[PDB]
C-alpha cells in the first residue's frame, strides 16, 4: 500500500517545495531553485513546466 | 476564414520528415 503511495507522495513533495521557492522570487536562476529543493536539475525543469500548465 | 485543414495535413507530415534531417 505504502510502496505504490510513496511514488506519488514523492512527486507531491517536489510540487509543494517548488511553489515555496517560487513565492517571493522573480527572475530566479533554475540552479538556485535546484539547490533549495536539493534535487537534480532536469527533474526540476520538467516539474516546473507541469506546474505552469 | 481560409481552409487551413486541407493544406496542414499534407504539409505537416511531409515537411516534418525533411526538417528532421535539416534541424533538431
Amino acid at each position: 500500500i505504502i510502496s505504490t503511495h510513496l511514488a506519488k507522495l514523492y512527486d507531491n513533495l517536489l510540487e509543494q517545495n517548488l511553489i515555496r521557492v517560487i513565492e517571493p522570487f522573480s527572475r530566479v536562476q533554475i540552479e538556485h531553485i535546484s539547490s533549495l529543493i536539493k534535487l537534480s536539475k532536469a527533474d526540476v525543469e520538467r516539474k516546473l513546466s507541469q506546474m505552469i500548465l | 476564414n481560409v481552409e487551413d485543414d486541407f493544406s496542414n495535413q499534407l504539409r505537416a507530415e511531409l515537411e516534418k520528415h525533411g526538417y528532421k534531417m535539416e534541424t533538431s
Binding site: 513546466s49 505552469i52 | 487551413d4 496542414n8 495535413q9 507530415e13 516534418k16 526538417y19 535539416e22 533538431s24
Partner: protein, 389 residues
C-alpha cells in the same frame, strides 16, 4: 446499431474527401430498410454532396444500388401495414388499451427505421396518450429525434430534443437519460462546434447498457478521440490517465492512445505526426466533423500554445520541426493565433530566438467579455427591425 446510420449520413459532407465516403454511407441503410424513403432522403444527400442511389443523377453511380432493393422494401412496408390493420381488428376483441397501443407503437418504430417521419408521428401519438412503461416512453421519443439526425435537417432536431429532455428528468431512469446524450452528441459534431460533444460521450460509456447501441469496445474508441479535441493536458490527465478502469480493461486502442499521450509528453514532433494521419483515419470512417477546418484550427492553437506557455525560448529549427509544416506556413498561422490574445508571442527570425511574453493576467479574461458580446449585439438589432413591422 442505429447510431452508425447517423454517422454515415454525415461522411459525404467532410470537405476532406467527398467520394470514398459514399460507399460508407450506403452500407448500413441497405440492411435496415431505408430504401423506400431514400428517394425523398436523396435531396438532403445532394447538399451533403453526392449520393450513389439508383435514382441519383449524382456523380458516383459506381456503387449504385440495384432496382430490386427499392421495390423489395416497398412491398415489405405494405405487407407490414396489412398485418397491422388486421391486428387492430383483433384488438377490440381483447383490451382496447393494451392491444391497439402495442401495435401502434411497434408500427411507429418500424416507420422510423425506414425514415418516414410523417408515418412515425401519427403512429406514436396514440401510444403517448395511453399508459405505457416509463423507460419505453423515453426510447420511443428518442426514435423521432433519430429520424431527424439521419435526415440532416437542423431545424427538425431542435423540436424533438426539447420535448424528450423534459420527459427524461421527470422519469426515474438514469440509464435512459444517458441515451439522449449520445443522440445529442451526434448533433454536437454535426454543427461546427466539436467541443460540446466530448462531454456527452465521457458519460455514456459508463451507463447506456447495450440495446440501441454498438459494442463496448467500438464505443470506447469514439470516447477517447473526442476527449482529446476539447480537453488540454490538465483536464485530459486527470480524467482519462488517472483512472483504474483503463488498466483493468486492457488497451486495444494504441493508435488513438499515442494521440492522447503526445500532449502529456509535450513533444509536438510526436503530436503532429499523429495528427496528419489520425485526422484522415478517424474522421472519414465515422463523423466527428462535417467541417474539416474547425478540427485542425483548434488542435494547432493548443499544440503551439502549450509548447509556448511552458518554455520561453526556442530555436527556429526546433520550432519548425516540432510543428511540422514550413516556416512560411507557421509564420502566417501565428498571425491568426495572436489575434485571439491568449498566445501573445513575438518571433525574432533575424536574431533566431522566438520569445514568448506570455501574460497570464486579467487582460485574457477581459478580452473574453468583450469578444463574446459582439455576436449577440449585432443579432438583436436585426430581431427588433423584424418584430416592429
Amino acid at each position: 446499431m442505429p447510431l452508425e446510420n447517423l454517422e454515415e449520413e454525415g461522411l459525404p459532407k467532410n470537405p476532406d474527401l467527398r467520394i470514398a465516403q459514399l460507399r460508407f454511407l450506403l452500407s448500413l441503410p441497405e440492411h435496415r430498410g431505408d430504401t423506400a424513403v431514400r428517394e425523398e432522403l436523396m435531396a438532403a444527400v445532394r447538399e451533403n454532396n453526392m449520393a450513389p442511389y439508383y435514382e441519383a443523377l449524382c456523380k458516383s453511380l459506381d456503387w449504385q444500388m440495384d432496382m430490386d432493393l427499392l421495390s423489395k422494401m416497398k412491398k415489405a412496408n405494405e405487407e407490414e401495414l396489412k398485418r397491422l390493420d388486421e391486428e387492430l381488428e383483433d384488438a377490440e376483441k381483447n383490451l382496447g388499451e393494451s392491444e391497439i397501443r402495442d401495435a401502434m407503437m411497434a408500427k411507429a418504430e418500424y416507420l422510423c427505421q425506414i425514415g418516414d417521419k410523417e408515418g412515425a408521428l401519427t403512429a406514436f401519438r396514440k401510444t403517448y396518450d395511453k399508459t405505457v412503461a416509463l423507460g419505453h416512453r423515453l426510447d420511443i421519443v428518442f426514435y423521432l429525434l433519430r429520424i431527424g439526425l439521419f435526415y440532416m435537417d437542423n431545424d427538425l432536431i431542435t423540436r424533438n430534443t426539447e420535448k424528450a429532455k423534459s420527459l427524461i428528468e421527470e422519469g426515474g431512469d438514469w440509464d435512459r437519460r444517458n441515451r439522449l446524450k449520445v443522440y445529442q452528441g451526434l448533433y454536437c459534431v454535426a454543427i461546427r462546434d466539436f467541443k460540446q460533444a466530448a462531454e456527452l460521450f465521457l458519460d455514456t460509456v459508463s451507463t447506456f447498457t447495450s440495446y440501441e447501441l454498438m459494442d463496448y469496445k467500438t464505443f470506447v474508441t469514439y470516447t477517447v478521440y473526442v476527449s482529446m479535441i476539447a480537453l488540454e493536458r490538465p483536464d485530459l490527465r486527470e480524467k482519462v490517465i488517472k483512472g483504474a478502469e483503463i488498466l483493468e480493461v486492457l488497451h486495444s486502442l494504441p493508435a488513438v492512445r499515442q494521440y492522447l499521450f503526445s500532449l502529456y509528453e509535450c513533444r509536438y514532433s510526436v503530436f503532429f505526426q499523429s495528427l496528419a494521419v489520425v485526422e484522415q483515419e478517424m474522421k472519414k470512417d465515422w463523423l466527428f466533423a462535417p467541417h474539416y477546418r474547425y478540427y485542425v484550427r483548434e488542435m494547432r492553437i493548443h499544440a503551439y500554445s502549450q509548447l509556448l506557455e511552458s518554455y520561453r525560448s526556442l530555436t527556429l529549427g526546433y520550432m519548425a520541426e516540432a510543428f511540422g509544416v514550413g516556416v512560411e506556413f507557421i509564420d502566417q498561422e501565428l498571425s491568426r493565433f495572436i489575434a485571439a490574445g491568449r498566445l501573445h508571442c513575438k518571433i525574432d527570425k533575424v536574431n533566431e530566438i522566438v520569445e514568448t511574453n506570455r501574460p497570464d493576467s486579467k487582460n485574457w479574461q477581459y478580452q473574453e467579455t468583450i469578444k463574446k458580446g459582439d455576436l449577440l449585439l449585432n443579432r438583436v438589432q436585426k430581431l427588433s427591425r423584424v418584430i416592429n413591422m
